[PDB]
Design a protein around this nucleic acid. Sequence first.
DNA 1: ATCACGTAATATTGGCCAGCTAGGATCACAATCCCGGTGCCGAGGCCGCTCAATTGGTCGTAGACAGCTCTAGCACCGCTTAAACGCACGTACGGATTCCGTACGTGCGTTTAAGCGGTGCTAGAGCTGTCTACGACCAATTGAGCGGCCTCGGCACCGGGATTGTGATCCTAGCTGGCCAATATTACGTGAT
DNA 2: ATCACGTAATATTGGCCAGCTAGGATCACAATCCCGGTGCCGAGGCCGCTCAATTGGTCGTAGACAGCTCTAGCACCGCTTAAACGCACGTACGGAATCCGTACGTGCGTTTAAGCGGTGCTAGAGCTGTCTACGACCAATTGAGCGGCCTCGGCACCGGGATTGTGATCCTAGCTGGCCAATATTACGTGAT
Lengths: 109, 109, 98, 98, 93, 95, 128, 128, 83, 85
Amino acid sequence: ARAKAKTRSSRAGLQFPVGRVHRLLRKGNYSERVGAGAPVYLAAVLEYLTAEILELAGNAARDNKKTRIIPRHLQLAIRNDEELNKLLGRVTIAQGGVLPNIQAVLLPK
Amino acid sequence: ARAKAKTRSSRAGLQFPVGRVHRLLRKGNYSERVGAGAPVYLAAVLEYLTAEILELAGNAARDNKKTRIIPRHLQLAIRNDEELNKLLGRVTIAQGGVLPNIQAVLLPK
Amino acid sequence: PHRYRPGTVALREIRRYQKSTELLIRKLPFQRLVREIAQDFKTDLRFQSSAVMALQEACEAYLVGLFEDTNLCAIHAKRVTIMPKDIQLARRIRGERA
Amino acid sequence: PHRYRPGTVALREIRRYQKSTELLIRKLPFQRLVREIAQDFKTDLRFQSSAVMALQEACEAYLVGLFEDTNLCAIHAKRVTIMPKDIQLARRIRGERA
Amino acid sequence: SRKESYSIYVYKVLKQVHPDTGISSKAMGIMNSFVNDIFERIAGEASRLAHYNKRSTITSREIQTAVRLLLPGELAKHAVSEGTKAVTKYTSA
Amino acid sequence: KRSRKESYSIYVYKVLKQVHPDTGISSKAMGIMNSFVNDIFERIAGEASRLAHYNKRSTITSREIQTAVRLLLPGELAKHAVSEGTKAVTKYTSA
Amino acid sequence: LIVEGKREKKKVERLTMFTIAQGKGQKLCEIERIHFFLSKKKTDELRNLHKLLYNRPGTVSSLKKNVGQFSGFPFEKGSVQYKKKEEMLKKFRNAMLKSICEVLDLERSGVNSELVKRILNFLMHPKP
Amino acid sequence: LIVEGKREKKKVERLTMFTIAQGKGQKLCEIERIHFFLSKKKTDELRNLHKLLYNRPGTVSSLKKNVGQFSGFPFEKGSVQYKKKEEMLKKFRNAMLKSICEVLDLERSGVNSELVKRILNFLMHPKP
Amino acid sequence: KVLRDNIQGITKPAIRRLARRGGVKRISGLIYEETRGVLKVFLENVIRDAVTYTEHAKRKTVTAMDVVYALKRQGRTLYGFGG
Amino acid sequence: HRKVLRDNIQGITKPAIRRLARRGGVKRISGLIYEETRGVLKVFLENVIRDAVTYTEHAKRKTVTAMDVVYALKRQGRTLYGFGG
DNA sequence: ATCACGTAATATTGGCCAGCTAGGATCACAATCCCGGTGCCGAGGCCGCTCAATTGGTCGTAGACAGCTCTAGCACCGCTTAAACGCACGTACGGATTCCGTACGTGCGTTTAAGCGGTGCTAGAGCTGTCTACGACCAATTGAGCGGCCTCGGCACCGGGATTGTGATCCTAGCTGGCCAATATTACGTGAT
DNA sequence: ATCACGTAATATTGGCCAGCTAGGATCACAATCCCGGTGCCGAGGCCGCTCAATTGGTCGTAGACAGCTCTAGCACCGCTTAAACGCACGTACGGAATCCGTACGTGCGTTTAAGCGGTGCTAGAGCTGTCTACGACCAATTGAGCGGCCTCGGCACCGGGATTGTGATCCTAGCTGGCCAATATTACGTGAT
């Protein structure tokens, strides 16, 4: 009388947890009521942003010949992207460091 | 036999509305449940801040010999007070203009 | 017969437009500009008068604060005159970049 | 006999401390400072290690961005050396009202 | 339909602070926006506090903490004083 | 005994192996990505709640999330996020 | 609402904050008459002369060597540069013009307008 | 928690942003000999002297007259200012020192250290 | 129809007035185009957010409250417009 | 058990400020920059730690945690990742 | 005795040889770079469990939809006039150049205290159970709040007078330039060789 | 006949006279302030009437509180260097001074279109009514996620070579200063007055 369990993330073709996002939206007092497509949409958005960040960071790492991402790679990916650096402009990453940027007038001639 | 009704404002010694604040807190979706002293305390805080601004604005208006307060007077009060200017820093006030401030170097010698 | 030396009428205009609060951009041009911009985001839009007035107040306050920061940058550069580099610096420090 | 001309070491240090990510303030003195400051807000306090490390990361990122803005202000003034006026300007612009 | 506001309450506070003084409609709209802004800030910080401590209830303590966090300096002190006084009074009756 | 805490770590691992199968990530970087997920979640959900309140509606649906995305995320980021969200909602409704 | 490609990454725009023109004539150093003057002269009279040849005054050390290599003015009579030099000569005090004549072996006995004309003709074609 | 008093009103701190020192002796314009030399001399020469006297060069216009107004050095022999002028003098080329001696009616014949001493004594007490 | 080249309605003297209200005494000639660009950017962002709030309200009319929310988003809260 | 810890700002030494500046792209540094920076940092720390100790007392704790610091900074508009932001 | 003149001793100046400084090229040292080996520890996988996610049914209500009103946004005209525009002109400003002093940068030896690892204590985080006080909820009440309407007074604007201020004009004193007369230079006549 | 030299004409320069310019003081005019006066229109009050605030009661459960476990913070110690400090020194930098060119401010006359009011039309905001799809909730089920454990992969670090950037040194070249020889100046003896 019970069908084989199939999680919402699987019903949406995602990796992030739809059930957990539903739970957090309900427990965050964001709204008295929460639709069924809201957590799906939100998880898909989070998954896309995560994938963007990780794509750029893995590219940065491969540029430094590294197979393993560390905070500096995330800082590079973020600050070298116009949209991410706008989204996370008021954000500080621990052990991220800075982007190499010597102003030209300081270089000798 | 029904006791005469006095508003929660009278019982607290305020001019601001406690019932309205309790309703907005209940209808503002800030928390599932709301205590009894929360709207009272909050209304008292709002009354205090309002009174502080109106004191400063009325002073400014008396300086210009004006009896009615206008947005310019509110801007003068706010920006001339440090704590208010701090809290209301990014706040923009329509028809409030700016403070007379000419940098010295621009003045003639 | 009479001719003010440059910089005098400017200080007078400063004291004037600081003693006052009237909007300094003409309304109809600003409204046409707003509709032009919006028409690139959605077509056949309508604006309340209060909405245009709000956008105008916001823009004037924003540009006024920007010009304050710009005059500070200029003065910092030992220059009375403001220049585009001053604006770019003010915005880069404000976080508006560009 | 070898001596580097002023500036060369500074640029090397710049390249170095930008390639790197370690914290640049010593941890013990910064911790003592945090506790000194907190004594004025509450007494007999306790700090988690992660809490002090977080305060340290934040204060270093803040000072680094401040020095970026300060170098920009300096350059704007046709200088290379940063001065207190440059910091005061960067702060007055960022909205900290120095 | 009836719209809500804070106007009469501001006129009451004013008369208590400046019985000789009045206020214009525009200034009143500014004061109304100021009240609503402060309200939203304090209530947001209070809700966030309750959530951080996994509390389902907002009480005078949460509001007092949100005040300490938001209002700056002697303002915070005198607001905490005025709120504690008001809660004391309300509890007495 | 029983101590439970939640994070997004394994989901970030999964996304990574989808985009960079031969690549890994450290624990510090994973904590940073967890903070990033929680931050963007709080931002989007707060914008969506405020939207529902502005319009005096008691429910958060795909529309509020879509608007909050289009408002918070910048430029092409918003377009591609909307695309992903719509695709996911479509697939979900086709149960 | 659904796109068809990958995000077009947008590149961030970070805010990024002594040619001796040889003219027509002999170098003032190769003219022994004028060269003997400069040897007897000091970096002050030459300083007046240089504030005239290259618009901007030179450095105590350079001033000397620079006046030494003046090969003449590469422009002709009536050019905008000729008029602009003639005005700069009219704006010099008559004692200065007499000092410049003495540095160029020109006669220091003439009306202002003649001292101007005789210096300006010499500065086109420095002749021994 | 209840503070029984009025609130202090704080104020926002906005980010706000040719004296001839008369010495001892006589003005170089009164001394007949020196005044006659300046009349015969030119703006050029006084560029080096105006640097020596007031630690700054002077306008081509207000140069000869300001050097004449020089009535002496208000400091005495052995002061930090005396030592700082003596070094300046040691750093001048021998031809310059001989030109400065000729502008002050001092004898141009002498060793560098004597030209320095004779100019420095004159610049304390300009005597006719 | 369609409005075009309406940025130029933000005229040189109007920018001059704004500057004066900001404490400016002397102004370059390039300041005017820089300011027009700055303003066009500001308005693009504010009006994008406002039109977003509008469509989300299923309206075809932009209200003042939409503008107020948009500015609040840009971090430039505005008082006196129904806030 | 309890001892006052005075003059601890001076533990933010000249070379440490120099390092921070270098990480910020600075080449040449005045001598007054050091005290200005110490004051700036003491102010920043005072505000952040005030907000954190506030969150703490509110939580009925006597120990300042990393979450208190993160919330305090997040409040100051300086969100921090890596500590559970 | 004082003074003019020739002679001798002392002193100055032009020429020369030597010293000093400039620029370019060459060379050595150090920093940066790379490349392979090592171990080390954190990343990543596996597994039992549990608790949070899923499923299936019931139910109430939030919100989609349709229809009506009427408010308000848009478009359009004509007049007035202040603002915008275009141009002429000149002052004050920005930029460039030079110079000078000293404040920073760099290197070095000494000091000092950060960092690490180890031991002991203990306060307080964190969790669980009890339970009471408190808040949510509903029904009747009711009275504060608010929209509509009227009406005076604060104020914004006009004209007149008055005050502060800026720009221009006028006067006084010093320096520079031209003109005229005295004196040095050059050519011719005349005296000596 | 050639050379040297007195005298006259020519040329250069100092004294005198006149013009020009910089600084200070004065005045004329023009923006700002003050003072009424006044018409207006928006604040301020009033009124009746609706729906949000209130009183009262009841009941579920949030969280205050006590008690226990045990993690993590704290204090202390002792080495071990790496970093910090003090200092000497010198050079690149900041600041000040000077000057020039022209860009921007100011003002005038002409053109434009903003503003203002009035008129007409109609989209769509806003409200109400309806009916229903959808989300909340509960109970039962179950599998994904979390924690603990383990075990090797990635990486840092080091030592040994290669390359490169920077600074010091060497070479050729130009300019200036000390020394030497020739010559001018000065003190003195002798002669004249």
